[PDB]
C-alpha cells in the first residue's frame, strides 16, 4: 500500500511554521492534504508553494531545476533557478578589446587541513 517519496520544504521554524510538501512519484491524489498552490514539477507534485514566473538564484534546491524560497504577507514561492545574467560578446573579425586599467583583487580561500584526533 505504501509507495512514493515525500519531502517537506521549510524555512526555519524560527522564521515560520509554513511548509511545502513535495510528492515525488505523484503527478497532480496520494497526498497528505491538498489545497491551493498545487504545482507539478519534474521532481514531483509540490503542494503549499506558490509558483512564480521570475527566476532567482537557488535558495532551497527542490530538484530538476526548481528552487524554493520564503519571499514576500509572506509565503513560500517556487521558481526555476536562474543560471546567471545573459550576456553577449560583440565579436567580429577585426574588433579587439584591450583593458586600459585594472584592479588588484584579494580573495579568500579556506581549506581544511586536519580533523580531530580520537582514541577509543
Amino acid at each position: 500500500c505504501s509507495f512514493g517519496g515525500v519531502s517537506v520544504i521549510t524555512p526555519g521554524t524560527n522564521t515560520s511554521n509554513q511548509v511545502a510538501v513535495l510528492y515525488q512519484d505523484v503527478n497532480c491524489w496520494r497526498v497528505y492534504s491538498t489545497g491551493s498552490n498545487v504545482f507539478q514539477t519534474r521532481a514531483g507534485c509540490l503542494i503549499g508553494a506558490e509558483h512564480v514566473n521570475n527566476s532567482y538564484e537557488c535558495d532551497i534546491p527542490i530538484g530538476a531545476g526548481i528552487c524554493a524560497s520564503y519571499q514576500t504577507s509572506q509565503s513560500i514561492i517556487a521558481y526555476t533557478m536562474s543560471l546567471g545574467a545573459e550576456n553577449s560578446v560583440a565579436y567580429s573579425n577585426n574588433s579587439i578589446a584591450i583593458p586600459t586599467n585594472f584592479t588588484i583583487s584579494v580573495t579568500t580561500e579556506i581549506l581544511p587541513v586536519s580533523m580531530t584526533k580520537t582514541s577509543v
Binding site: 503527478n27 530538484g63 553577449s88 560578446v89
Partner: protein
C-alpha cells in the same frame, strides 16, 4: 556566471564549430556531439516520476524500479537539468570562441579567432606567422579532426 550568447553569424577564420555549438532545431539546446553522447549512455530510468498506478499489478515484480520503490529505495533527481548543463557548456564555448581565455580572468574581451589561435601558437613556442601562413590548412585539419 555570465551566460554568453553564441554570436549570430559564425566568421571564425574558417574554423567550423557547428558540431559543438548548441542546435536550436532540436528541443534541447544541445549540440550535435552532445546528442551523440546522450544516446550512448543509457540510464536506469528517465523522468523520476513513476506513479503508483504504473507499478500496480505484476509490473511491480517485473520492473526493477518498482521493486526498488516498494522497498523504500528512492532515486532523487539532480538539481541541474540536462538543459541547464547544456546552457552552461554553450556559455563556456561562446566565451572561449569569441574572447579567448579572457573571460575566465575577468570580463570577456572579444578578439578575432585567428588572432586568438596566433596567441595560442605563441603559447607553445611557434611564431604566429606560422599560423597566419597556414591558416586555411590548420582550419581544415581542425574541421576534419572534429568530423
Amino acid at each position: 556566471k555570465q551566460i554568453y550568447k553564441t554570436p549570430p553569424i559564425k566568421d571564425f577564420g574558417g574554423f567550423n564549430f557547428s558540431q559543438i555549438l548548441p542546435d536550436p532545431s532540436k528541443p534541447s539546446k544541445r549540440s550535435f556531439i552532445e546528442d551523440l553522447l546522450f544516446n550512448k549512455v543509457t540510464l536506469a530510468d528517465a523522468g523520476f516520476i513513476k506513479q503508483y498506478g504504473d507499478c500496480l499489478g505484476d509490473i511491480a515484480a517485473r520492473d526493477l524500479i518498482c521493486a526498488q520503490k516498494f522497498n523504500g529505495l528512492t532515486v532523487l533527481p539532480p538539481l541541474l537539468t540536462d538543459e541547464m548543463i547544456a546552457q552552461y557548456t554553450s556559455a563556456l564555448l561562446a566565451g572561449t570562441i569569441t574572447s579567448g581565455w579572457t573571460f575566465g580572468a575577468g570580463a570577456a574581451l572579444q578578439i578575432p579567432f585567428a588572432m586568438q589561435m596566433a596567441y595560442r601558437f605563441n603559447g607553445i613556442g611557434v611564431t604566429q606567422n606560422v599560423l597566419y601562413e597556414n591558416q586555411k590548412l590548420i582550419a581544415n585539419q581542425f574541421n576534419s579532426a572534429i568530423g
